[PDB]
């Protein structure tokens, strides 16, 4: 099939595009996700859109431009039977962090620590950027992290849950994928911040170190239970920061599992340290995304001459825009290694 579509980036410029081998990759009322070939493979998300309002995902993507965010190549509209569909044509990336992790778990293997570092730096850098653009992703999970199998480039994708969190506007609590859902959301907070993304990113990191989700809850309440069996019962003051409607209950006091006893032997200490700095009950005690990029755990990526395990160059890690260097300038000396 062939269509005239609008360029994803730049001024409103039209381009005739032609695609074939259209196959459903995923269904659901959240939209339909196809894969097709243009001759490059591409992803197309078809979603029903109320004609009277802008598409939230489209506006966010047209506003982000970063090497660690999936590119919107084109978009076009469609009808069928006021029934309007928006079609987002996105850059196709062969793998996801989820697919890679499952290959390692199926093979009963551990992901090499260097790739954990390379991937998680890029996630944290991408979160720094989108947060600086006013966008909270709200669905950070391995299945939404695209990775190139060869270059180790990581791109965040699926902004269908994403939202600008405006101070004072209530937002939906039952958001994110459950294993990665921040505890304040499980407590039904509506005034949460973009630090829910950092909680989710901490869950990914732990998952890459463990070989399985850190918090595998089978329901909303069991998710809080899985978190508590690791972190211990939140204090009343932590509950107060999450949702003050719960400060007056008597929750049972469960001891924390020591962080160094949560992870396998030979897990790097700085990896454990970073996890504990991200996986904090109180949202404002979680590291900022840029703070996580500057963590000691990523020191290997800043060392002159560090290379990928398949002996290729590291992907772009230090080509910071002027905006990025303005986010938390006091980390700039750490973020930019001396050798520039």
């Amino acid at each position: 099939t062939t269509v005239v579509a609008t360029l994803g980036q730049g001024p409103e410029r039209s381009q005739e595009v032609a695609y074939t081998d259209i196959k459903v990759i995923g269904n659901g009322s959240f939209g339909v996700v196809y894969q097709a070939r243009l001759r490059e493979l591409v992803a197309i998300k078809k979603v029903l859109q109320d004609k009277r309002f802008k598409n939230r995902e489209l506006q966010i993507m047209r506003k982000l431009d970063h090497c660690n965010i999936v590119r919107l190549r084109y978009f076009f509209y469609s009808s069928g039977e006021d029934e309007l569909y928006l079609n987002l044509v996105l850059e196709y990336v062969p793998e996801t962090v989820y697919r890679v992790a499952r290959h390692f778990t199926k093979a009963k293997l551990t992901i090499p620590i260097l790739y954990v570092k390379v991937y998680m730096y890029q996630l944290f850098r991408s979160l720094a950027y989108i947060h600086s653009q006013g966008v909270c992703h709200r669905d950070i999970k391995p299945q939404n992290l695209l990775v190139d199998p060869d270059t180790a480039v990581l791109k965040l994708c699926d902004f269908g849950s994403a939202k600008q969190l405006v101070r004072g506007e209530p937002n939906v609590s039952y958001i994110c994928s459950r294993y990665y859902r921040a505890p304040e959301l499980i407590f039904g907070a509506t005034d949460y911040t973009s630090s829910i993304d950092v909680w989710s990113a901490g869950c990914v990191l732990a998952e890459l170190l463990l070989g399985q989700p850190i918090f595998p809850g089978d329901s909303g309440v069991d998710q809080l239970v899985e978190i508590i069996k690791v972190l211990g019962t939140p204090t009343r003051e932590q509950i107060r920061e999450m949702n003050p409607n719960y400060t007056e209950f008597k929750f049972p006091q469960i001891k924390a599992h020591p962080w160094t006893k949560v992870f396998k032997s030979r897990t790097p200490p700085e990896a454990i340290a970073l996890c504990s700095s991200l996986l904090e009950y109180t949202p404002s005690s979680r590291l900022s995304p840029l703070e996580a990029c500057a963590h000691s755990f990523f020191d290997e990526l800043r060392c002159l001459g560090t290379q990928l395990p398949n002996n290729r160059p590291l992907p772009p890690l230090f080509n910071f825009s002027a905006g990025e260097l303005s986010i938390q300038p006091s980390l700039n000396a750490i973020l930019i290694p001396p050798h520039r």
């Binding site: 309440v221 239970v225 508590i228 209950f249 008597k250 929750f251 049972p252």
Partner: peptide, 17 residues
């Protein structure tokens, strides 16, 4: 959704740990 209902559920699950 009611905090008392949710908290009571949570307390019962935590007690079983």
């Amino acid at each position: 959704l009611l905090p008392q209902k949710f908290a009571e559920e949570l307390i019962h699950r935590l007690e079983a740990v």
